[PDB]
């Protein structure tokens, strides 16, 4: 719903507050989201590179 | 009994819990320590 990105999506085990959509890291990069339809938190890890 | 404050443009330092809630803060224009 607006957040555009790339990466691997994975089942999370963090708990947002029930009005927060996505989570950010220190240095300010999106690293978790909440799925609008099912309302579950998913981590966003980058794509294997090197 | 009721109160009315007003809001100004300030800069704060918010401390976030591990669940993601704000538990403490610092107003950075109060005094030299802040």
């Amino acid at each position: 719903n607006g957040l555009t990105g790339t990466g691997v999506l994975t089942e999370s085990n963090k708990k947002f507050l029930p009005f927060q959509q996505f989570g950010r890291d220190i240095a300010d990069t999106t690293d978790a989201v909440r799925d609008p339809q099912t309302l579950e938190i998913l981590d966003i890890t980058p794509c294997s590179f090197g | 009994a009721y109160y009315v404050g007003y809001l100004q443009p300030r800069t704060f330092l918010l401390k976030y819990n591990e669940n993601g809630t704000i538990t403490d803060a610092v107003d950075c224009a109060l005094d030299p320590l802040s």
Partner: peptide, 24 residues
């Protein structure tokens, strides 16, 4: 009358989760 707030009127500036991070 007038009174003194102490530490009152702090709101979450927006969505986006977050944990232990003295964010400015």
């Amino acid at each position: 009358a007038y009174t003194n707030s102490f530490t009152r009127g702090v709101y979450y500036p927006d969505k986006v989760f977050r944990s232990s991070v003295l964010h400015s």
